[PDB]
Design a protein around this nucleic acid. Structure first.
Lengths: 95, 78, 89, 104, 88, 79, 103, 93
DNA sequence: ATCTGACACGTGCCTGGAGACTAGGGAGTAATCCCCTTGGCGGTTAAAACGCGGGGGACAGCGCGTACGTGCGTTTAAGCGGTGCTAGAGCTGTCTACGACCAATTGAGCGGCCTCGGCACCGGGATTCT
DNA sequence: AGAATCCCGGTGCCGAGGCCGCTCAATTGGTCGTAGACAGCTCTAGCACCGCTTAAACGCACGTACGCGCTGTCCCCCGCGTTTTAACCGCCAAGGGGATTACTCCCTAGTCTCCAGGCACGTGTCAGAT
């Protein structure tokens, strides 16, 4: 057959991280894997368009932060960028 | 067979969207706008499929033909 | 009325039954494709009619916004026609 | 510490979003801060939409998240409505609205 | 009045002037940018006011389609805000 | 003061381009509201582009990229 | 006939669009006939919009194509309108439209 | 310090089409941006089709399908037939 | 009818484009199992179809008052020109640091089973608008 | 007061959670070369301070175009009650054509190398604004 890439298992453990009782029916697994595919496509498409406009050829942390600060609305961008900055600073606090 | 989508089904599609009273000449108008929408979206679905040298039009292709008009559908694997 | 308003706003269903929509979609794809026919995957028509149902619901809701802007209660067809002409399509 | 996902706090696979940023022809050189940043913002967006769908699910006296909770949790909030302002969620319905001039 | 309708459609100039739009746009960029003011390059302001004039003319034309729909002839502000609420 | 400084006959010249016969006297505050909202959106996107590029003079080509992004694209300035 | 432009029977460049299809990270392997074909579709769109704007330009009796000529040739078609239903031509003006009921 | 354009080719197409009229430089600028915008649309849809079919080339049949997506009714049909006539006159050499 | 100036046109050169040939892998073409999608017969029934009564609303009217175009002095800042500036755009020269890339290694995450419980549905109390 | 509409109990059943064996891509370690990150020079144009002009904003008089709340005529959707009919489940059968592998011709990256297409400078002459 064929192995398929899907974000079902990760959505499920983020779900049981948030509130430890409720489970998700399979059509909500389908909505969430299509959702993370669509948000990932928007942020990577804006990533390649910024690195293309700016006459560079590499995508780094500053550029994904600029893509997030553009795309998301008013406060959601502010706290999403603060999540990104603390996750990256702890990643480089290990290696 | 555009007449097949029945008249009280158009009435229930209206009454989902908050409407109270429905006119009499509205039914040919909503069949017209349904035929415009369906003909555009299966034009793009057919274009993707007959590109890929295939004949079963797959639901991932109709999700792509909805994706390019902005009005993308979730739940079916985009 | 009002009870079917809250009944059809509570329900998650599909409001046009499946087989006449399938006959419609297959006739319109036989109009294209250089004349010869195709066959649909089983949930391709389900994807298609969920999109068609959500488009008709949003179209009628925006036209009814126009109607009770215009000082009426009904839905004459020029509301659907003019709300379709303003949304930029 | 023999993954990098579980090194960076997160729960999303930063390895395969690095693989998708390479094999999905976005740019040639993808630095190793970018996919960790990108799966961090995806894990935050999943955590926010699932917090909202979860408190709606506890509101309707149920214990699953079915798609109608996902419509009510992306539409009964405003910044997620400005992010997802065009899509059609499958099997979702509409939010309960009746205009003013209609009501007797 | 009909003569300035035809004279402002046959013209192809731009309608809100240079310095009040420059001071408006520089105030709105001072509110962002952490306080520290930028330098608007002097063709970007022509870009921005031709953008804003295209947006305002399309808005007033669609709201006026709404008020010739409604029966009136004037342009009430609820027609502007509803023609913005329909188009997204 | 400056937002009340974009003049009122400039608003009604904008209107008489679109083909409007009678302008109500209350339209002017709502059209200044919609102009200020439009400029907040496009100046947030242009500011974020020209601050990512580390370029303290806002160019015109990034304003064109900001309009090209949110979908009302502009022709003439190197699109 | 060394250059591919006058090999392919065109007027646009094909080296420049081949360089853009390689360096603009669209895909890795850009085939041989694809930049020639894309220069052909760009040539047809440009020749049709300039037949239209040139004929409007000599209808209003000026010797040169200015921007409002481009906006009359775009807004007085319908397939060019559906292709360009969003764009804003700078220094452009609008289409002259006055209804019948408002007067 | 060089900077590239498309102005010479637009001028050659115009004084092919009808040989009296020339172009004021703002119209060169506008349809310079028009050629660049149509190019980015067709090649973006090119990349998206050849990524959705798990493929790795941008070839002629794929550009022909992208053109028949993006353009309206008659314009797609006659732009595709013009492109096929250009590719025939190329690949017969 | 004329001037104010910019679109059209001529030489140096120079960076990118064409030619010739190499080298690896990508996509054409065939081939086989098998998924599943078209096609067609019982049979139940939910819902579509429809005729007529009944009031609910669309629409013309009209007179009252109210807010908007327009005329006319009257002031207010926009616009162009000098004209001087210095900030920061842009080019460029090294130079380190970081990301492709290869080769093995190993759990991670995926297909499949499978048994288990949340909700669909039915049925019963009870409460109560208009 | 007629259905309406909320708790609660009972019965069943098909999707979810979880275990389990298992390919394969994701990590670790080491090599390396090139892309972008800083210094450092230039030097174009965005800012700004003042002067002089003057086209446009503006404040009000006022006349009237016209918004609109209440009036009546009429027609026309909604609901009800019987009819009828085509979807729907379920079964069954069967045959495209999807998908996935095996092979391999050729089709494009890549590199050296010569050369001209096109851009960047100047210089003229008529196109249009009143």
């Amino acid at each position: 057959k064929s192995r398929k890439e899907s974000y079902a298992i990760y959505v499920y453990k983020v779900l049981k991280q948030v509130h430890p009782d409720t489970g998700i029916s399979s059509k909500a697994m389908s909505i969430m894997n299509s959702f993370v595919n669509d948000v990932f496509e928007r942020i990577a498409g804006e990533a390649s368009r910024l690195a293309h406009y700016n006459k560079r050829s590499t995508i780094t942390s500053r550029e994904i932060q600029t893509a997030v600060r553009l795309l998301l609305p008013g406060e959601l961008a502010k706290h999403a960028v603060s999540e990104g900055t603390k996750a990256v600073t702890k990643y480089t606090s290990a290696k | 067979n555009i007449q097949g989508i029945t008249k009280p089904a158009i009435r229930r599609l209206a009454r989902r969207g908050g409407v109270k009273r429905i006119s009499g000449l509205i039914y040919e108008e909503t069949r017209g706008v349904l035929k415009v929408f369906l003909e555009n979206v299966i034009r793009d679905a057919v274009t993707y499929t007959e590109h890929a040298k295939r004949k079963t039009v797959t639901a991932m292709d109709v999700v792509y033909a909805l994706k390019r008009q902005g009005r993308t559908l979730y739940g079916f694997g985009g | 009325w009002l009870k079917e308003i809250r009944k059809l706003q509570k329900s998650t269903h599909l409001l046009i039954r499946k087989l006449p929509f399938s006959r419609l979609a297959r006739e319109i794809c036989v109009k294209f494709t250089r004349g010869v026919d195709f066959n649909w995957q089983a949930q391709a028509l389900l994807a298609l009619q969920e999109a068609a149902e959500a488009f008709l619901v949003h179209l009628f809701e925006d036209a009814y916004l126009l109607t009770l802007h215009a000082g009426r209660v009904t839905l004459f067809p020029k509301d659907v026609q003019l709300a379709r002409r303003i949304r930029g399509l | 510490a023999k993954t990098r996902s579980s090194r960076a706090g997160l729960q999303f696979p930063v390895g395969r979003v690095h693989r998708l940023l390479r094999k999905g022809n976005y740019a040639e050189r993808v630095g190793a801060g970018a996919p960790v940043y990108l799966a961090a913002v995806l894990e935050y967006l999943t955590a926010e939409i699932l917090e909202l769908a979860g408190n709606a699910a506890r509101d309707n006296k149920k214990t699953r998240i079915i798609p109608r909770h996902l419509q009510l949790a992306v539409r009964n909030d405003e910044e997620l409505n400005k992010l997802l302002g065009r899509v059609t969620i499958a099997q979702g319905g509409v939010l309960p609205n009746i205009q003013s001039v209609l009501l007797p």
